[PDB]
């Protein structure tokens, strides 16, 4: 029957881009006869202002009652001076990921046709193009390991975090990465620091174990330091990157920046039962909120991922995805996607969402 | 009296580039009337072949008897299939750094005049140039924290590593970074993951404490994921990056790759008494060993750093550095520094070292 979405738009540009994603979703809902109901909940900075913490109990409960979380972006200068355990980004995201066992983080990143010049890559390298999916383990590793904290005082005061992974944790995220590569260019690059870390040694070992179920998929391993170098020089040679929590954090950001168009990039954080959290790869960008300049595509595509992965509405997802393609090849680009020559052709946040929603309605 | 250097050339191109560094050192020794004696010791792959382990007791002892270690590069496909605790790179480097308390790792990286086109950066970004020194803590953090290892079996088997830092450890590496920035463009960017890690929270706090002694130096903090993005887009805006062990590992490699000329990059790993290990930033590059194509500059400049930091021979260090500059502006470039148009002008490893040594002798 009726799917239920918890909408957690957050701070900065979160609400202005979410409006567009909802618009585009309305068009898909009409097209494909989907019954989806949405409820908005405060999260992040806005929840601190309205409820005193970044993840109110009522927001968490709302997410428990939902089929998926359509998440915008959290954080801003207003809350930057809070203590770490009170700050809105970590305080929204990590407890959500932990509470819903969102172990799989998917961050697809491609260099889009006609947007090479925005890539910080040398032109010959951007011309080759790339499509790299980062598959990052999201509920384990050093993010959530214990013990975590500090002891002592003065010069001998120490703080500590424990990177821990079990075989089961590694194998479930590896399987996602292999399955994904099977649908793509059949290569998994597993990123670790096996020359230094015991966690990484187990990582590498278990990824090799999972590989036996995927004779069709090429496995290679790379150190995270070396990986930062290779993505810069030859990102065309990667297909799926499979990473631990901290290493995928790092690499997914690098890869996103290499596109030159982070406003296009969405992500999915999924548990094993199909519930997930779908959010743009980029931040709350408070510098631009309320001006109608923010690119809503990453939010719109977060809604497409939501449809695909949580709602099992692949047609609807793909329709959104095609409508975004159509915008990008029909002169509907926000200002950050354009060179200075061309920046006067910039579309506003509402123009973009209107275009995209209209493309969905028109049968793209 | 006579300085004593332990020379640990290692594997792959290590020995062919070390020969040049020794050549250039001989010229400096003659110029500045330095009395330096050197003894070669096996390390890495060659030590596994000759002694059964990557860091023989006699090599470690040789290093104990020395004023500094002039280190080449370790590792190669021959040893790649060994267990992690037997492999030559980690097995040479980490016990050296730990045994000599080499807490400070310095990796200067600049985009050289006339070599912008080799940078994987977009041309307008490479044209702006950059000079970024990574100051990385080298003896602490997750590299050496305990507990480290694994427990259990089967799906519930777990491995673990503990990221730990005390105030004392953070403050000593922070001081290096501030002192270095005071000599440069007066900015320290401290890189952490304070939104997630307790270790990072202490990092950030203590770096802010150290800052009070440096009113002249601008401090800013950045998350390691965000840092990977910003170095790509605007590396001209960084001066000194100050990083924990794992975060500096990652970032220093990224920054080195952004130069496009890793064969030029040297590094210094120093304890608080002035003993250190000086090594190129790039690996053993077995693909090219024995062919006389390897760029010896990074090794030559490792010898310059050795002179400066361990031997207190600043004039000699700078002479080497000027002789390398002279090579690079006098058409003495190895093939990897040249575009395909120009690659037939490539100099061999010996030609480069002969040039550089001759420039030192000639009074550059
Ligand atoms: C905000 C922070 C806790 C988070 C993370 O580290 O996972 C963010 O960088 C991310 O990539 O979603
Ligand atoms: C070989 C490895 C243990 C080492 C490190 O991780 O420190 C290397 O990557 C480095 O940058 O010197
Ligand atoms: Mg991140
Ligand atoms: Mg490294």
The DSSP annotation for B288-342 comes to GTTSS-S--HHHHHHHHHHHHHTT--HHHHHHHHHHHHHHHHTT--BGGGS-GGG
Which residues are CB-neighbours of B98 under 8 A, at least 6 positions away?
B139, B144
**3-class secondary-structure state, position B45:** helix
| Contact call for A155 and B167, based on CB within 8 A | yes
CA distance A119 to A129: 10
Residue pair A141/A245 in contact (Cβ under 8 Å)? The answer is yes
CA distance A359 to A199: 47
Q: What angle do CA A240, A241, A246 make, to 5 degrees?
A: 150
Q: Please indicate whether residue A131 is annotated as part of the active site.
A: no
Exposed/middle/buried for residue A216 (C-beta within 10 Å: 0-12, 13-18, 19+): exposed
Residue with token string 């006389």: B292
Exposed/middle/buried for residue B156 (C-beta within 10 Å: 0-12, 13-18, 19+): exposed
- CB crowding A173-198: b at 16 or more within 10 Å, else e: bbbbbbbbbeebeeebbbbbbbbbbb
Residue pair A133/A184 in contact (Cβ under 8 Å)? The answer is yes
Q: Give B73's strand partners.
A: B10
Q: How many CA atoms lie within 13 A of A38 on its CB side?
A: 19
Q: What is the Å distance from ligand 3's center to A284 Cα?
A: 13
Token pair belonging to B90:
């980690």
Q: Which residues of A are annotated as a binding site for Mg(2+)?
A: 225, 249, 253
* Atom number of ligand 1 nearest to Cα A138: 7
Which residues are CB-neighbours of A253 under 8 A, at least 6 positions away?
A281, B225, B226, B228, B229
Element (H, E) at B246: helix B245-259
CA distance B266 to B305: 8
Report whether residue B287 contacts ligand 1, using a CB cutoff of 6 Å.
Answer: no
User: Any idea of the CA torsion for B352, B353, B357, B363, to the nearest 10 degrees?
Assistant: 20
CA distance A111 to B134: 29
Token pair belonging to B327:
């090579």
**What does this entry list as its resolution, in Å?**
1.5
Q: Which of A198, A229, A253 sits opposite B257 (nearest CB)?
A: A229
Closest alpha carbon to A19 in A271, A306, A299: A299
Token pair belonging to A300:
């719109």
Helix axes A349-361, A314-329, angle to 10 degrees: 120
Report whether residue B246 contacts ligand 2, using a CB cutoff of 6 Å.
Answer: no
Closest alpha carbon to B192 in B161, B211, B165: B165
Closest ligand to C-alpha of residue A143 is 1
Q: Give B151's strand partners.
A: B158
Q: Give A163's strand partners.
A: B161
Query: DSSP class of residue B170?
Result: H
Residue pair B112/B220 in contact (Cβ under 8 Å)? The answer is no
Give one DSSP letter per residue of A210-268, joined into a string: HHTT-TTSEEEEEEHHHHHHHHHH-GGG-SEEEE-HHHHHHHHHHHHHHHS-GGG-EEE
Residue nearest to atom 6 of ligand 2 (CA): B249
Give one DSSP letter per residue of B100-149, joined into a string: TT--EEEEEEEPPTT-GGGSSB-HHHHHH--EEEEEEE-SSGGGT-SS-E
CA distance A241 to A258: 15
Helix runs in chain A, H state only = 14-32, 45-51, 57-64, 88-99, 123-128, 167-182, 198-211, 224-233, 245-259, 297-309, 314-329, 349-361
Token pair belonging to B296:
């010896």
Q: Which residues of B are annotated as a binding site for NAD(+)?
A: 76-89, 283-295
Element (H, E) at A283: none
Q: Which of B119, B171, B195 sits opposite A122 (nearest CB)?
A: B119
Q: In this structure, are strands B104-110 and B266-270 parallel, antiparallel, or unpaired?
A: antiparallel
Give the domains, in start order, of chain B with CATH numbers: 1-364 (3.40.718.10)
- CB crowding B69-96: b at 16 or more within 10 Å, else e: bbbbbbbbeebeeeebeebbbbbbbbeb
Residue pair B149/B162 in contact (Cβ under 8 Å)? The answer is no
Work out whether the CA dihedral A175, A176, A179, A182 comes out positive or negative. negative
Residue B186 zone, left/alpha/beta (φ > 0; ψ -120 to 50; rest): left
Closest alpha carbon to B174 in B165, B164, B185, B162: B165
Residue with token string 């881009």: A17
Residue nearest to atom 10 of ligand 1 (CA): A249
CA distance A1 to A249: 36
Q: Please indicate whether residue A216 is annotated as part of the active site.
A: no
Q: Please indicate whether residue A193 is annotated as part of the active site.
A: yes
Residues of A in contact with B143 (CB under 8 A): 196
Q: How far is CA A100 from the centre of its chain?
A: 16
Work out whether the CA dihedral B230, B232, B233, B238 comes out positive or negative. positive
CA distance A98 to A68: 15
Which residues are CB-neighbours of A169 under 8 A, at least 6 positions away?
A103, A137, A139, A140
CA distance A194 to B84: 7
Residue of A75, A145, A250, A258 best to disrupt the B interface, most CBs of B under 10 A = A250
Residues of A in contact with B90 (CB under 8 A): 195-196
Residue with token string 């590069």: B73
CA distance B11 to B18: 11
Residue A149 zone, left/alpha/beta (φ > 0; ψ -120 to 50; rest): left
Q: How many CA atoms lie within 13 A of A215 on its CB side?
A: 0
Q: Give B328's strand partners.
A: none
CA distance A163 to A170: 13
The Cα-based distances of A354 to A72, A159, A333, A359 in angstroms read: 19, 50, 12, 9
User: Any idea of the CA torsion for A140, A146, A151, A154, to the nearest 10 degrees?
Assistant: -10
| Contact call for B194 and A155, based on CB within 8 A | no
Q: What angle do CA A101, A104, A108 make, to 5 degrees?
A: 150
Q: Give B38's strand partners.
A: B5
Token pair belonging to A274:
């199909």
Phi and psi, residue A284, nearest 5°? -80, -10
Q: Is the CB of residue B94 less than 8 Å away from at least one CB of chain A?
A: yes
Q: Is the CB of residue A95 less than 8 Å away from at least one CB of chain B?
A: no
Closest alpha carbon to A190 in B305, B260, A199: A199
First-residue to last-residue Cα distance in chain B: 26
Residues of A in contact with B152 (CB under 8 A): 166
Rg (CA), chain A: 20
Q: In this structure, are strands B68-73 and B3-10 parallel, antiparallel, or unpaired?
A: parallel
Please report the beta strands in chain B, taking only residues with DSSP state E, as ranges in sequence order. Answer: 3-10, 36-40, 68-73, 104-110, 131-137, 149-151, 158-166, 187-192, 218-223, 240-243, 266-270, 276-280
| Contact call for A94 and B158, based on CB within 8 A | no
CA distance B164 to B142: 6
Q: Give A267's strand partners.
A: A279
Helix axes B198-211, B167-182, angle to 10 degrees: 50
- Which of A3, A11, A41, A193 is catalytic? The answer is A193
CA distance B128 to A150: 42
The Cα-based distances of A101 to B160, B202, B237 in angstroms read: 20, 28, 39
Which residues are CB-neighbours of B153 under 8 A, at least 6 positions away?
none
Number of Cβ within 10 Å of residue B310's Cβ equals: 24
Token pair belonging to B67:
């004023």
Q: Which experimental approach was used here?
A: X-ray
Q: Which of A87, A171, A198 sits opposite B161 (nearest CB)?
A: A198
Report whether residue B279 contacts ligand 2, using a CB cutoff of 6 Å.
Answer: no
Q: In this structure, are strands A104-110 and A131-137 parallel, antiparallel, or unpaired?
A: antiparallel
Residue A59 zone, left/alpha/beta (φ > 0; ψ -120 to 50; rest): alpha
Closest alpha carbon to A302 in A68, A67, A65, A57: A68
Q: Is the CB of residue A285 less than 8 Å away from at least one CB of chain B?
A: no
Query: DSSP class of residue A114?
Result: T
| Contact call for A120 and B233, based on CB within 8 A | yes
Q: Please indicate whether residue A38 is annotated as part of the active site.
A: no
CA distance B226 to B326: 37
Token pair belonging to A341:
């020559």
Token pair belonging to A27:
């068009």
């Amino acid at each position: 029957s009726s799917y239920q979405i918890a909408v957690l738009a957050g701070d900065g540009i979160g609400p202005e881009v979410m409006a567009e994603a909802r618009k585009v979703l309305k068009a898909v809902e009409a097209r494909f006869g989907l019954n989806i109901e949405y409820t908005e909940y405060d999260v992040g900075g806005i929840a601190i202002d309205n409820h005193g913490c970044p993840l109110p109990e009522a927001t968490l409960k709302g997410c428990e009652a939902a089929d998926a979380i359509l998440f915008g972006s959290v954080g801003g200068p207003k809350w930057e001076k809070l203590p770490p355990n009170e700050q809105p980004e970590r305080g929204a995201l990590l407890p959500l990921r932990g509470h819903f066992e969102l172990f799989c983080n998917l961050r697809p990143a491609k260099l889009h046709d006609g947007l090479e010049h925005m890539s910080p890559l040398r032109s010959d390298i951007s011309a080759r193009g790339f499509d790299v999916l980062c598959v990052r383990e999201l509920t384990g590793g050093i993010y959530f390991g214990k013990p975590k904290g500090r002891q002592g005082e003065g010069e001998s005061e120490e703080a500590f975090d424990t990177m821990r992974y079990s075989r089961r944790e590694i194998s479930r995220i590896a399987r996602i990465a292999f399955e994904a590569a099977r649908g793509r260019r059949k290569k998994v690059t597993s990123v670790d620091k096996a020359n230094v870390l015991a966690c990484s040694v187990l990582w590498r070992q278990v990824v090799e174990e999972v590989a036996v179920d995927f004779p069709d998929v090429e496995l290679e391993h790379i150190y995270i330091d070396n990986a930062t170098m290779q993505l810069l020089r030859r990102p065309d040679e990667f297909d799926v990157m499979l990473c631990s929590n901290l290493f995928g954090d790092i690499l997914s950001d690098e890869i996103a920046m290499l596109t030159g168009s982070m406003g296009l990039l969405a992500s999915a954080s999924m548990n094993s039962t199909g519930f997930g959290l779908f959010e743009p790869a980029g931040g709350s960008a408070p510098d631009i909120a309320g001006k109608g300049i923010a690119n809503p595509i990453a939010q719109i595509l977060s809604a497409a991922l939501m449809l695909r992965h949580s709602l099992k509405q692949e047609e609807a997802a793909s329709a959104i995805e095609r409508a975004v393609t159509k915008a990008l090849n029909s002169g509907y680009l926000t200002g950050e996607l354009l060179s200075s020559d061309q920046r006067h052709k910039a579309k506003t946040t509402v123009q973009m969402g209107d275009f995209i929603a209209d493309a969905v309605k028109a049968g793209v």
